[PDB]
mmCIF file of all heavy atoms in Angstrom:
data_model
loop_
_atom_site.group_PDB
_atom_site.id
_atom_site.type_symbol
_atom_site.label_atom_id
_atom_site.label_comp_id
_atom_site.label_asym_id
_atom_site.label_seq_id
_atom_site.Cartn_x
_atom_site.Cartn_y
_atom_site.Cartn_z
ATOM 1 N N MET G 2 -4.930 2.716 6.054
ATOM 2 C CA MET G 2 -3.688 3.198 6.618
ATOM 3 C C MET G 2 -2.939 4.090 5.622
ATOM 4 O O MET G 2 -2.180 5.033 6.014
ATOM 5 C CB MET G 2 -2.768 2.015 6.847
ATOM 6 C CG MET G 2 -3.079 1.109 8.095
ATOM 7 S SD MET G 2 -2.323 -0.476 8.047
ATOM 8 C CE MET G 2 -0.608 -0.015 8.455
ATOM 9 N N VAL G 3 -3.227 3.842 4.301
ATOM 10 C CA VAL G 3 -2.651 4.617 3.205
ATOM 11 C C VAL G 3 -3.377 5.966 3.130
ATOM 12 O O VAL G 3 -2.712 7.013 3.141
ATOM 13 C CB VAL G 3 -2.693 3.946 1.814
ATOM 14 C CG1 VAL G 3 -2.061 4.856 0.691
ATOM 15 C CG2 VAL G 3 -1.932 2.633 1.820
ATOM 16 N N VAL G 4 -4.709 5.940 3.233
ATOM 17 C CA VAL G 4 -5.509 7.106 2.919
ATOM 18 C C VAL G 4 -6.882 6.788 3.513
ATOM 19 O O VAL G 4 -7.378 5.691 3.344
ATOM 20 C CB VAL G 4 -5.680 7.430 1.417
ATOM 21 C CG1 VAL G 4 -6.994 8.274 1.140
ATOM 22 C CG2 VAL G 4 -4.441 8.246 0.959
ATOM 23 N N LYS G 5 -7.511 7.829 4.177
ATOM 24 C CA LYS G 5 -8.773 7.742 4.809
ATOM 25 C C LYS G 5 -9.662 8.626 3.978
ATOM 26 O O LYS G 5 -9.535 9.838 3.877
ATOM 27 C CB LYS G 5 -8.818 8.153 6.318
ATOM 28 C CG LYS G 5 -8.149 7.197 7.345
ATOM 29 C CD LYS G 5 -9.105 6.474 8.256
ATOM 30 C CE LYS G 5 -10.069 5.482 7.573
ATOM 31 N NZ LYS G 5 -9.373 4.260 7.197
ATOM 32 N N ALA G 6 -10.676 7.978 3.384
ATOM 33 C CA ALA G 6 -11.638 8.433 2.512
ATOM 34 C C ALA G 6 -12.248 7.112 2.214
ATOM 35 O O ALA G 6 -11.572 6.128 1.949
ATOM 36 C CB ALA G 6 -11.216 9.140 1.249
ATOM 37 N N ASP G 7 -13.556 6.996 2.428
ATOM 38 C CA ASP G 7 -14.114 5.627 2.438
ATOM 39 C C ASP G 7 -14.290 4.854 1.160
ATOM 40 O O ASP G 7 -14.497 3.636 1.153
ATOM 41 C CB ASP G 7 -15.436 5.533 3.289
ATOM 42 C CG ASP G 7 -15.496 6.332 4.612
ATOM 43 O OD1 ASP G 7 -15.769 7.554 4.599
ATOM 44 O OD2 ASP G 7 -15.276 5.650 5.670
ATOM 45 N N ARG G 8 -14.115 5.610 0.064
ATOM 46 C CA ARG G 8 -14.155 5.201 -1.244
ATOM 47 C C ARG G 8 -12.815 4.949 -1.812
ATOM 48 O O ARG G 8 -12.756 4.434 -2.920
ATOM 49 C CB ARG G 8 -14.902 6.194 -2.188
ATOM 50 C CG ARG G 8 -14.120 7.504 -2.445
ATOM 51 C CD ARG G 8 -15.031 8.533 -3.113
ATOM 52 N NE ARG G 8 -16.056 8.953 -2.126
ATOM 53 C CZ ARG G 8 -16.701 10.155 -2.026
ATOM 54 N NH1 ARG G 8 -16.770 10.979 -3.061
ATOM 55 N NH2 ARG G 8 -17.301 10.573 -0.866
ATOM 56 N N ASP G 9 -11.680 5.386 -1.181
ATOM 57 C CA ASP G 9 -10.378 5.174 -1.738
ATOM 58 C C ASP G 9 -9.863 3.912 -1.233
ATOM 59 O O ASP G 9 -8.911 3.343 -1.708
ATOM 60 C CB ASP G 9 -9.332 6.289 -1.341
ATOM 61 C CG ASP G 9 -9.546 7.487 -2.245
ATOM 62 O OD1 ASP G 9 -10.768 7.855 -2.423
ATOM 63 O OD2 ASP G 9 -8.530 8.024 -2.755
ATOM 64 N N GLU G 10 -10.604 3.337 -0.224
ATOM 65 C CA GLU G 10 -10.186 2.186 0.528
ATOM 66 C C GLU G 10 -10.062 0.872 -0.374
ATOM 67 O O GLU G 10 -8.996 0.253 -0.225
ATOM 68 C CB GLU G 10 -10.990 1.848 1.816
ATOM 69 C CG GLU G 10 -10.691 2.883 2.890
ATOM 70 C CD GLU G 10 -11.508 2.808 4.156
ATOM 71 O OE1 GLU G 10 -11.686 1.734 4.786
ATOM 72 O OE2 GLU G 10 -11.955 3.923 4.560
ATOM 73 N N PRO G 11 -10.948 0.488 -1.255
ATOM 74 C CA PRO G 11 -10.800 -0.659 -2.162
ATOM 75 C C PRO G 11 -10.230 -0.187 -3.419
ATOM 76 O O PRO G 11 -10.147 -1.010 -4.289
ATOM 77 C CB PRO G 11 -12.255 -1.144 -2.389
ATOM 78 C CG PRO G 11 -13.131 0.131 -2.172
ATOM 79 C CD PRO G 11 -12.331 0.945 -1.126
ATOM 80 N N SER G 12 -9.997 1.136 -3.601
ATOM 81 C CA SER G 12 -9.534 1.676 -4.881
ATOM 82 C C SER G 12 -8.171 1.135 -5.247
ATOM 83 O O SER G 12 -7.379 0.787 -4.410
ATOM 84 C CB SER G 12 -9.516 3.228 -5.103
ATOM 85 O OG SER G 12 -10.818 3.774 -4.978
ATOM 86 N N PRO G 13 -7.889 0.903 -6.561
ATOM 87 C CA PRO G 13 -6.716 0.079 -6.986
ATOM 88 C C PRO G 13 -5.445 0.878 -6.682
ATOM 89 O O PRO G 13 -4.458 0.264 -6.356
ATOM 90 C CB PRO G 13 -6.884 -0.259 -8.555
ATOM 91 C CG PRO G 13 -8.216 0.350 -8.907
ATOM 92 C CD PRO G 13 -8.907 0.744 -7.614
ATOM 93 N N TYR G 14 -5.472 2.278 -6.798
ATOM 94 C CA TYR G 14 -4.230 3.063 -6.589
ATOM 95 C C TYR G 14 -3.868 2.936 -5.168
ATOM 96 O O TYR G 14 -2.680 2.805 -4.868
ATOM 97 C CB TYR G 14 -4.370 4.559 -7.058
ATOM 98 C CG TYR G 14 -3.071 5.326 -7.099
ATOM 99 C CD1 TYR G 14 -1.972 4.828 -7.766
ATOM 100 C CD2 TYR G 14 -2.945 6.454 -6.274
ATOM 101 C CE1 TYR G 14 -0.693 5.446 -7.689
ATOM 102 C CE2 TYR G 14 -1.659 7.061 -6.206
ATOM 103 C CZ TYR G 14 -0.598 6.651 -6.927
ATOM 104 O OH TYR G 14 0.641 7.206 -6.725
ATOM 105 N N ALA G 15 -4.846 3.006 -4.214
ATOM 106 C CA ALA G 15 -4.580 2.867 -2.848
ATOM 107 C C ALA G 15 -3.964 1.520 -2.500
ATOM 108 O O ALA G 15 -3.067 1.458 -1.670
ATOM 109 C CB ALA G 15 -5.857 3.034 -2.024
ATOM 110 N N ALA G 16 -4.423 0.436 -3.196
ATOM 111 C CA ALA G 16 -4.011 -0.950 -3.019
ATOM 112 C C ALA G 16 -2.552 -1.134 -3.558
ATOM 113 O O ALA G 16 -1.954 -1.984 -2.960
ATOM 114 C CB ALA G 16 -5.016 -1.899 -3.792
ATOM 115 N N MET G 17 -2.196 -0.464 -4.687
ATOM 116 C CA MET G 17 -0.928 -0.607 -5.302
ATOM 117 C C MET G 17 0.161 -0.170 -4.292
ATOM 118 O O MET G 17 1.192 -0.883 -4.083
ATOM 119 C CB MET G 17 -0.666 0.142 -6.630
ATOM 120 C CG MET G 17 -1.613 -0.091 -7.807
ATOM 121 S SD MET G 17 -0.993 0.626 -9.286
ATOM 122 C CE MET G 17 0.401 -0.348 -9.549
ATOM 123 N N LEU G 18 -0.054 0.988 -3.636
ATOM 124 C CA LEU G 18 0.910 1.577 -2.793
ATOM 125 C C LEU G 18 1.051 0.770 -1.542
ATOM 126 O O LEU G 18 2.162 0.651 -1.000
ATOM 127 C CB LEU G 18 0.422 2.996 -2.431
ATOM 128 C CG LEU G 18 0.325 3.961 -3.633
ATOM 129 C CD1 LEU G 18 -0.101 5.444 -3.166
ATOM 130 C CD2 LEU G 18 1.623 4.125 -4.501
ATOM 131 N N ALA G 19 -0.120 0.185 -1.089
ATOM 132 C CA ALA G 19 -0.067 -0.687 0.151
ATOM 133 C C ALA G 19 0.750 -1.915 -0.017
ATOM 134 O O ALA G 19 1.553 -2.290 0.821
ATOM 135 C CB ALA G 19 -1.435 -1.089 0.543
ATOM 136 N N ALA G 20 0.637 -2.619 -1.178
ATOM 137 C CA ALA G 20 1.385 -3.737 -1.557
ATOM 138 C C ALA G 20 2.829 -3.353 -1.781
ATOM 139 O O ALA G 20 3.665 -4.149 -1.366
ATOM 140 C CB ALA G 20 0.861 -4.435 -2.829
ATOM 141 N N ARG G 21 3.161 -2.200 -2.401
ATOM 142 C CA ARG G 21 4.518 -1.710 -2.721
ATOM 143 C C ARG G 21 5.293 -1.530 -1.392
ATOM 144 O O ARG G 21 6.416 -2.040 -1.291
ATOM 145 C CB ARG G 21 4.586 -0.472 -3.552
ATOM 146 C CG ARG G 21 5.959 -0.090 -4.049
ATOM 147 C CD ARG G 21 6.604 -1.117 -5.000
ATOM 148 N NE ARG G 21 8.010 -0.795 -5.132
ATOM 149 C CZ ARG G 21 9.064 -1.447 -4.547
ATOM 150 N NH1 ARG G 21 8.866 -2.499 -3.687
ATOM 151 N NH2 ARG G 21 10.357 -1.069 -4.759
ATOM 152 N N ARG G 22 4.619 -0.980 -0.354
ATOM 153 C CA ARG G 22 5.291 -0.739 0.902
ATOM 154 C C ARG G 22 5.801 -1.979 1.565
ATOM 155 O O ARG G 22 6.916 -1.993 2.052
ATOM 156 C CB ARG G 22 4.396 -0.006 1.883
ATOM 157 C CG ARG G 22 4.304 1.563 1.590
ATOM 158 C CD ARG G 22 3.167 2.280 2.386
ATOM 159 N NE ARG G 22 2.977 3.600 1.726
ATOM 160 C CZ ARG G 22 2.149 4.580 2.166
ATOM 161 N NH1 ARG G 22 1.269 4.284 3.176
ATOM 162 N NH2 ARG G 22 2.317 5.860 1.704
ATOM 163 N N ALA G 23 4.961 -2.991 1.509
ATOM 164 C CA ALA G 23 5.257 -4.258 2.092
ATOM 165 C C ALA G 23 6.405 -4.906 1.431
ATOM 166 O O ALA G 23 7.225 -5.576 2.032
ATOM 167 C CB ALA G 23 4.067 -5.264 2.053
ATOM 168 N N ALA G 24 6.429 -4.772 0.074
ATOM 169 C CA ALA G 24 7.301 -5.325 -0.890
ATOM 170 C C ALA G 24 8.747 -4.828 -0.584
ATOM 171 O O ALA G 24 9.749 -5.542 -0.807
ATOM 172 C CB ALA G 24 6.846 -5.167 -2.314
ATOM 173 N N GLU G 25 8.945 -3.481 -0.196
ATOM 174 C CA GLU G 25 10.199 -2.880 0.170
ATOM 175 C C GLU G 25 10.807 -3.571 1.380
ATOM 176 O O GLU G 25 12.014 -3.831 1.469
ATOM 177 C CB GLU G 25 10.020 -1.355 0.408
ATOM 178 C CG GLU G 25 9.606 -0.549 -0.785
ATOM 179 C CD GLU G 25 9.033 0.825 -0.402
ATOM 180 O OE1 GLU G 25 9.600 1.495 0.508
ATOM 181 O OE2 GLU G 25 8.035 1.248 -1.113
ATOM 182 N N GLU G 26 9.926 -3.921 2.428
ATOM 183 C CA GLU G 26 10.271 -4.655 3.628
ATOM 184 C C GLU G 26 10.756 -6.045 3.389
ATOM 185 O O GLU G 26 11.661 -6.555 4.021
ATOM 186 C CB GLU G 26 9.208 -4.628 4.716
ATOM 187 C CG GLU G 26 8.374 -3.376 4.671
ATOM 188 C CD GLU G 26 7.432 -3.302 5.829
ATOM 189 O OE1 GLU G 26 7.159 -4.361 6.448
ATOM 190 O OE2 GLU G 26 6.958 -2.214 6.220
ATOM 191 N N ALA G 27 10.093 -6.707 2.376
ATOM 192 C CA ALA G 27 10.356 -8.006 1.919
ATOM 193 C C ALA G 27 11.701 -8.138 1.255
ATOM 194 O O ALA G 27 12.360 -9.140 1.300
ATOM 195 C CB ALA G 27 9.232 -8.603 0.988
ATOM 196 N N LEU G 28 12.101 -7.083 0.519
ATOM 197 C CA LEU G 28 13.394 -7.036 -0.064
ATOM 198 C C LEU G 28 14.559 -6.973 0.956
ATOM 199 O O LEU G 28 15.562 -7.621 0.673
ATOM 200 C CB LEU G 28 13.406 -5.774 -0.888
ATOM 201 C CG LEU G 28 12.801 -5.936 -2.392
ATOM 202 C CD1 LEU G 28 12.455 -4.490 -2.932
ATOM 203 C CD2 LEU G 28 13.520 -6.807 -3.371
ATOM 204 N N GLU G 29 14.427 -6.294 2.103
ATOM 205 C CA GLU G 29 15.330 -6.214 3.250
ATOM 206 C C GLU G 29 15.641 -7.567 3.896
ATOM 207 O O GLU G 29 16.805 -7.941 4.202
ATOM 208 C CB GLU G 29 14.830 -5.281 4.328
ATOM 209 C CG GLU G 29 14.602 -3.854 3.928
ATOM 210 C CD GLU G 29 14.234 -2.942 5.097
ATOM 211 O OE1 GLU G 29 13.441 -3.378 5.978
ATOM 212 O OE2 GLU G 29 14.783 -1.772 5.206
ATOM 213 N N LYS G 30 14.518 -8.366 4.006
ATOM 214 C CA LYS G 30 14.489 -9.728 4.459
ATOM 215 C C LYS G 30 15.180 -10.697 3.501
ATOM 216 O O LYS G 30 15.760 -11.698 3.943
ATOM 217 C CB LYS G 30 13.051 -10.312 4.571
ATOM 218 C CG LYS G 30 12.124 -9.769 5.709
ATOM 219 C CD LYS G 30 12.612 -9.943 7.181
ATOM 220 C CE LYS G 30 12.858 -11.381 7.559
ATOM 221 N NZ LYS G 30 13.336 -11.425 8.984
ATOM 222 N N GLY G 31 15.172 -10.418 2.185
ATOM 223 C CA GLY G 31 15.713 -11.342 1.248
ATOM 224 C C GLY G 31 14.545 -12.356 0.779
ATOM 225 O O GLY G 31 14.851 -13.375 0.129
ATOM 226 N N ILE G 32 13.296 -11.942 1.116
ATOM 227 C CA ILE G 32 12.147 -12.507 0.415
ATOM 228 C C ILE G 32 12.205 -11.944 -0.980
ATOM 229 O O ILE G 32 12.077 -10.789 -1.134
ATOM 230 C CB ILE G 32 10.799 -12.155 1.002
ATOM 231 C CG1 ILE G 32 10.608 -12.867 2.358
ATOM 232 C CG2 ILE G 32 9.765 -12.566 -0.017
ATOM 233 C CD1 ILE G 32 9.380 -12.430 3.174
#
């Protein structure tokens, strides 16, 4: 969902940004 390229999919930079996005939502919630 971050980036379509089949090798970027398990790549750590791609993973960092995916987790960061979620993390912003979590802060709104007060998680």
